[PDB]
Design an enzyme around this catalytic site. Structure first.
Site, PDB file in Angstrom:
ATOM      1  N   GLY A   1       8.408   2.049   7.503  1.00 38.57           N
ATOM      2  CA  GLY A   1       8.574   0.613   7.569  1.00 38.57           C
ATOM      3  C   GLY A   1       7.670   0.291   6.110  1.00 38.57           C
ATOM      4  O   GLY A   1       7.414   1.416   5.395  1.00 38.57           O
TER       5      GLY A   1
ATOM      6  N   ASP B   1      -0.490   7.408  13.942  1.00 36.58           N
ATOM      7  CA  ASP B   1       0.939   7.749  14.229  1.00 36.58           C
ATOM      8  C   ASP B   1       1.198   8.859  15.570  1.00 36.58           C
ATOM      9  O   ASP B   1       2.262   9.192  15.830  1.00 36.58           O
ATOM     10  CB  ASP B   1       1.588   8.836  13.016  1.00 36.58           C
ATOM     11  CG  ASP B   1       1.826   7.556  11.835  1.00 36.58           C
ATOM     12  OD1 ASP B   1       3.213   7.137  11.798  1.00 36.58           O
ATOM     13  OD2 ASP B   1       1.446   7.601  10.642  1.00 36.58           O
TER      14      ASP B   1
ATOM     15  N   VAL C   1       0.920  -1.349  -0.091  1.00 42.42           N
ATOM     16  CA  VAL C   1       0.045   0.038  -0.132  1.00 42.42           C
ATOM     17  C   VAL C   1       0.793   1.315  -0.025  1.00 42.42           C
ATOM     18  O   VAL C   1       0.402   2.448  -0.440  1.00 42.42           O
ATOM     19  CB  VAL C   1      -1.029   0.222   1.194  1.00 42.42           C
ATOM     20  CG1 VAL C   1      -2.146  -1.076   0.914  1.00 42.42           C
ATOM     21  CG2 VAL C   1      -0.713   0.024   2.388  1.00 42.42           C
TER      22      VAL C   1
ATOM     23  N   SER D   1       5.110   2.932   1.441  1.00 40.19           N
ATOM     24  CA  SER D   1       6.125   2.875   2.421  1.00 40.19           C
ATOM     25  C   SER D   1       7.261   3.971   2.296  1.00 40.19           C
ATOM     26  O   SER D   1       7.362   4.757   1.424  1.00 40.19           O
ATOM     27  CB  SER D   1       7.172   1.404   2.210  1.00 40.19           C
ATOM     28  OG  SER D   1       7.576   1.690   0.875  1.00 40.19           O
ATOM     29  N   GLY D   2       7.775   4.167   3.590  1.00 43.96           N
ATOM     30  CA  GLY D   2       8.705   5.124   3.945  1.00 43.96           C
ATOM     31  C   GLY D   2       9.990   4.828   4.694  1.00 43.96           C
ATOM     32  O   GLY D   2      10.336   3.778   4.557  1.00 43.96           O
TER      33      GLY D   2
END
Ligand SMILES: O=c1cc(C(F)(F)F)c2c(-c3cccc(C(F)(F)F)c3)n[nH]c2[nH]1
Length: 334
Positions: free
Chosen positions: A32, A162, A26, A28-29
């Protein structure tokens, strides 16, 4: 221990138990990687985040521990919480990967701003507050509330992601200024920026850097009055603030022209400069503007949250191991 299995997902190797089928990427950065998946055990569609480099340093080992501790604790329908956490490792020795499972949502509240009437606003900001109220009550500051970390369903149920770990457009003036002791009402500031944007379609403070960001804040709420000027510790900050051109507090009913007056009223209460006078999440829930949604016995608070670990300096093997205990003690929700 369940039966795991392996596959290559773009760059990364994934090793998930058999209960999750049809992994698909979906996004990612440096968070993870996240995959979408089917959870056979519950019928639910889920998001599975494979953490990137969980224990590279002391600061990643702490980050990982904090984030497992936050997720394990959040149980509230406007806040993400943990369905599962697992690793392929079978002893502490071979433990190097941590996966977190949560309800899938994929759309975020930006994916909507570029599509926002009055009652849609109400329901969306009431939900965010109802979750901040739960969050603030365990004595946690989100610190990075912004559209991309507010997830919405197709029927417009909203969840905060977050939290606790941490785009300049939604930060309070006091953080721009680097105050080291800001309270929970930095989150209410950001909520104020987010509701503004939803009602009008525009970024309220699209500062192009941090000096800019503040110029644009003081332009709407005015430069500090004397009641507030006198609570500023910092020599340099006092000196910064006090050295700009004096700016008057604007009338919010002009700036938000033909918005609902109740909505303009709430904004004026979220966006007070002086953080001691900003409305609280619990008090905002009682505000006129949520007349149609507010219910005092359906706005619960959190169990206490032990954040005593935030002031420990531990070895990399110690956080690793505290995390491990946490993966192990995990009791799935009902
Ligand atoms: O040492 C400090 C430094 C600061 C800092 F925020 F200014 F940095 C502060 C503040 C404070 C709170 C809200 C808004 C502002 C403002 F943005 F209006 F300037 C300042 N209160 N007390 C302080 N003591």
């Amino acid at each position: 221990r369940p039966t795991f299995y392996r596959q290559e997902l773009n760059k990364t190797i994934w090793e998930v138990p058999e209960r999750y089928q049809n992994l698909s990427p979906v996004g990612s950065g440096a968070y993870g990687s996240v995959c979408a998946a089917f959870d056979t055990k519950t019928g639910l569609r889920v998001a599975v985040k494979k953490l990137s480099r969980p224990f590279q340093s002391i600061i990643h080992a702490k980050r990982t521990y904090r984030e497992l501790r936050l997720l394990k604790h959040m149980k509230h329908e406007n806040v993400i919480g943990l369905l599962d956490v697992f690793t392929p490792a079978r002893s502490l020795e071979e433990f190097n990967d941590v996966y977190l499972v949560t309800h899938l949502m994929g759309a975020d509240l930006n994916n909507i701003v570029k599509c926002l009437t009055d009652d849609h606003v109400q329901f969306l900001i009431y939900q965010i507050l109802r979750g901040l109220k739960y969050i603030h009550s365990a004595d946690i500051i989100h610190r990075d509330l912004k559209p991309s970390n507010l997830a919405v369903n197709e029927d417009s149920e909203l969840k905060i992601l977050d939290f606790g770990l941490a785009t300049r457009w939604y930060r309070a003036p006091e953080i721009m200024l680097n105050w080291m002791h800001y309270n929970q009402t930095v989150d209410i500031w950001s909520v104020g920026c987010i509701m503004a944007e939803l009602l009008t379609g525009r970024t309220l403070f699209p500062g192009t850097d941090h000096i800019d960001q503040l110029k644009l804040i003081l332009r709407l709420v005015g430069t500090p009055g004397a009641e507030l000027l006198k609570k500023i510790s910092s020599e340099s900050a006092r000196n910064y603030i006090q050295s700009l051109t004096q700016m008057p507090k604007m009338n919010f009913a002009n700036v938000f022209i033909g918005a609902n007056p109740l909505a303009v009223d709430l904004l004026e209460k979220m966006l007070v400069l002086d953080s001691d006078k900003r409305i609280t999440a619990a008090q905002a829930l009682a505000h006129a503007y949520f007349a149609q949604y507010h219910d005092p016995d359906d706005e619960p608070v959190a169990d206490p949250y032990d954040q005593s670990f935030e002031s420990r300096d531990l070895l990399i093997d110690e956080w690793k191991s505290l995390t491990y205990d946490e993966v192990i003690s995990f009791v799935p929700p009902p």
